[PDB]
Every structure is written in structure tokens, then in C-alpha cells.
Amino acid sequence: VTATDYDTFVSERFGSIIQAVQTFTDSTKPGYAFIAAKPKSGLYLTTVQREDIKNYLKDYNLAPITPSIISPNYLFIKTNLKVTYALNKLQESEQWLEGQIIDKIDRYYTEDVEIFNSSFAKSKMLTYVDDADHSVIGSSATIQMVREVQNFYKTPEAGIKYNNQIKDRSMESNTFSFNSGRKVVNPDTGLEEDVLYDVRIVSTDRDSKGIGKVIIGPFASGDVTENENIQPYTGNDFNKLANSDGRDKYYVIGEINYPADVIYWNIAKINLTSEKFEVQTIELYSDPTDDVIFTRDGSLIVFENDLRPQYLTIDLEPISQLEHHH
Amino acid sequence: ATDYDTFVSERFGSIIQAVQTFTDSTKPGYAFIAAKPKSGLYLTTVQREDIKNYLKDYNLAPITPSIISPNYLFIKTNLKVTYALNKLQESEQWLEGQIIDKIDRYYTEDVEIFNSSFAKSKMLTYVDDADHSVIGSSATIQMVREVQNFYKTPEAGIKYNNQIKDRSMESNTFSFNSGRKVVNPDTGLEEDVLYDVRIVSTDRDSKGIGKVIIGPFASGDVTENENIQPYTGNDFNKLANSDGRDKYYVIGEINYPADVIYWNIAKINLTSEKFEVQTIELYSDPTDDVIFTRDGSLIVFENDLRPQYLTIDLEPISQLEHHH
């Protein structure tokens, strides 16, 4: 028993295609012993869905509790890097240089951060970035935590957490398409099926107890049917998106507990069927109050640029030389 | 029992002196381990959280065994030892000490153990054994179950694992708070009159059942509607008064032969609020002079901490026209 004993158990019987193990138990889900497992190479163990996470299932000793071999709950860092260097000090291209900083940004992660109950610090990685040339003068960054959400429709039973604290309104997802039942025409073309607009999930400033709503919109006046319950969110209090289509009526569908660090929603709370949504998986961005981001139970801060390039933009800036004369 | 108790009995043998597991027919799913500190009576909630946190050590995710303190059965002993003047060197105060040790040495060795039992005949031979001058003893016992909540018996019941006599079951006294004002300038302008009260049992019926009734009231401060009306039987023990109080009422009932005791004050519209206690003690005379333990019950002599459950009368003898 004991998660620690189990972590080993697997750092042996598998200690081949596995880099790390976190055996934690969830207080919401009794009798279930959860086993986080980093593939040591990629991200998901049998993304093929078990091929692997079923083999470990097939390891049994004692107890009335049952294993649930999962892939680690990944925290991502959407970094907007802005390194600046000296035109002259540089001998190879900006292209070769990028491939030089991300070689470092990786060295940091995989040595200090990509570990269980281990953490990430922006200041500490920007030291690694700075440390890629004779110049390279300095560097800026703007990060957000990312949680990848399977089934956009609704969060888990027990909500999703970051293992970190975010700021008011900080929480927002990427946009996805909502197929309004309605139909419209332009450019000599026809019905064009059903009108679609870009819609998304955002949080609101916390109330006097640490608790804002999780709202979704915009909409039409519209494509969502209003009840005694279902009513457009009452007031400004968050981040609205570009109505290049003019729209705006958002609806409440959950809440963030900022202090408790839990976020729940369920689109079924209004009456939209997942059919009315193109997507399956979405991204949930928030920006921390943390100058240090903590991983934790089954959570793991990882940097996989190749397979997750989207989570890193590098904007370089070249600089004129100074005094060359003496 | 020992399947898991023993282990625990290894990593903690320096405190726990008694460990046994059991289930509750009823609290299905739950497995409890009673443990008695070698060092007294109740393990401390820190001693308890440590011991529970070896449950993780041995991996089990299911809610896993509740550790808890043993269900104690106490013997209120009323001892009498008659001894020879000539042959007794030290003080009477010494002699007592000398025997009150023997009692404990018998309890520790033959009694304080799970499902082991107390035999009044044995411990008396221990008493006899305490000095070369302790000519002969006698002894009168009662059973004490220490009740966690006075207001209602457990869902299931309270049992002694032993046969008691009629009218025998009787708790001690606890203040009931009527609600009237007294108007006394001695202590201000208002005391809130509160008179003692106990909970006794009455005589077996045709069929083996008694009624668990509750001490004296003053008509008014208990509301009676047809159904809930004063008990009338005189088949129980009433208590010492100075007040005009003779109205006892009926809650639960004793099943003498199956020894189960259920009661619930609620059966008379009286909230816990109304009584200034939270814990009580239930006494009762055994049928026999050999008394038993069963599931998670443990019999124990902890006399520097429950001194109220032993009294010693000595009788010094010489020669002799008289020893009472």
C-alpha cells in the first residue's frame, strides 16, 4: 500500500518507458488510487488509450481499492517571450538563435521543472534564456497557465484546479464555434446552412467571498432560450470578446472558487446540446499571481515545444551597436 | 481481531495494551479497532491520528479501519476486608494501598484483555493474598457503562453483555432546567430553577421486558397530551426529595433477557438544551459474580483515575466477642 510503495512498484515493473510516478488519492473519489505517469518521452501514455494504461491496470497484489492509471494533469505555460540582442554580437541567424534559446528553455524545464511536486519560475527560466549568447542583452515574458480540457461541454464532477492562484477575470478559454440553428445568405450564395459565431468561456471578478461566475458568450437575442433560470448575465464584470458579428449576451454556467482553486461549468445549465458546438477539447488560460507556479498532485509543469509549439512565441529584437571607436 | 491488531500491536506496543477489531452488525462496511492505552484509558487524538496514518503505510484506499477507544465495562466494587490486629504492622492507609495493588495486578493479568472476564471470586483471592494478615474478604459489585450521550441510546442500543436484576439499571443524577424564574435577591433577580433527575428501569413484564423511565418532575414543566402521560407502577426506584416531585415519565425500554437498552428523551418533547450535562453513567447489579466482555467491550480497573468505583471497608480483629 502507500502511494510511495506503489510509485516504486511501477518505477520497476515498467521502469523502462516511464519517467515519473505520482500516486495520489482523490478525496472526492474514494477506493480509487490514482497513478500519474509521465511517458519519459512524449505526453500521454497510450494516447492510443491504454495500450499502456491497461497494462499497469494488470498489476495486482492486495486491497479493496482499485488502481486508475491516468496520464498526468498537465499545467502548460503560454509564454510570450520577447528576447532582445545586439545586431553585431550575433553571427548566425535569428532562426539559428531561436533554436538556441528554446534549447535552453528546455534545459531549464527538464532539469528543474518537469518533475512531480516540483515548480516553475519565470524569473528563473529567463535567466536560462538570457544565457544563450554573448548577446542577448535581456528578455521579457508574459505567461499564462494553460489547462487542456477534454469535453468542453462540462468540467469534471469535482471541478478543475490549477494548483495555483489566478487573478480576477484571468480565466478564459480559446474561442470555438457555436452553430446557431438559424440560416442566412450573402454574396449570391444561398442559405449557407446555419449561422455560426465564435463563442467562449470566461470568468468574472470574484464576489465578496472569493467567487465569480463562469460565463459563456456572446450570443443572439438570440440563439439561447431564456427561462426563470436561464437569463443573460446581469452585468459588466469581465472580459467580452470582439463582436465583429455585433453580438453580446452572455450566460452564467458555473463558477470559480478563487481561494479554493476550483472551476466548474456545465453547458447543460443553459440548454445547449454539444451538437451545437464544433469542438471537443478546449484550452483554459488564466494568468497567475504567482511569480512561482506549483505543480502538485498528479499535476506536472511540462515544456513540449515540438508537440506543443503553440505555447511559445519568441519575438526577437535586434539592437544597434554602441561605441565602436577607441 | 489479531489479523490487523497484532501488527499495530508491534509498531505501538509502547502505548497500546489492548487491540482487537470487530464489525457492527448494522454499521455494515465499517471495521473498528478498539485500543486501550497501556498508559491509562483513552488514546489521545494525536496518538490516534498517528496510528490511523499507518493505514496509508499499508496501502488501502477504501475507507480503512477506524481506530477508537474500547467500550469499557466498569465494576463498582464495594469491598470489605477483615484483618488481624496483631499481624498488621503498618497503617490501615498502607494496607489499603497494598491490596488496591493486588486488585490491579489481577485486572492487568487476567481481566484487562479482550473477551477475557472478571470473576469476583478470583480478585477476592487476590485481595486475601495481599498481606499475610488479611484473614478474609467479601465484596459487592455493580456494572458501570459510561454513556457518551445521555439524551438517546445509540441507534442500536446499549448492552452490558451481562444479565442485570430488576429495577437494577439506574443512571446517576443530572440537572434538568424547568424554565421558570425564582425571583431571589440573594443571587440577583432570577435563577432558572433546575432540579436533579435520573433514568431508572422497572420490573420485567410477562415476557421479559421492562420500561426505561426518567426521574421526577413538577407536572407543569413536562407537557402531557393523551399518550404521553405520567408513568404509574411503583415497580422501580424513586429518589430522595425535598421537593413536591413525583411524576416520572416513560422513554425507551430494557429487554432484560436480550440485555438491550434503548431510550430517547425525545419521546417526551425535551430538547438536549434542557439538561445541563452531556455524559452520564449507567449502573446495574449483575445477576452473577462472573461478568463478561464481547465485541470491543473491555473490563478494566483504573483506580487512580476512577477511584469512585472502589470503596474499601476494613475490619480489625483481635479476640473477639465482636466484628459487627
Curated annotation (Swiss-Prot), chain B:
Top-level taxon of the source organism: Viruses
Compartments in which it is found: Virion
Induction: Expressed in the late phase of the viral replicative cycle.
Stated role: Baseplate protein that is located next to the tail tube (inner baseplate). Involved in the tail assembly. The gp25-(gp6)2-gp7 module is involved in sheath contraction.
Subunit structure: Homodimer; each gp6 molecule in the ring interacts with its two neighbors, forming an N-terminal dimer with one and a C-terminal dimer with the other. Heterotrimer with gp7; gp6 is part of a (gp6)2-gp7 heterotrimeric molecule. The (gp6)2-gp7 heterotrimeric molecule further interacts with gp25 and gp53; the gp25-(gp6)2-gp7 module is involved in sheath contraction.
Family: Belongs to the T4likevirus baseplate wedge protein gp6 family.
Protein name as catalogued: Baseplate wedge protein gp6
Organism, scientific name: Enterobacteria phage T4
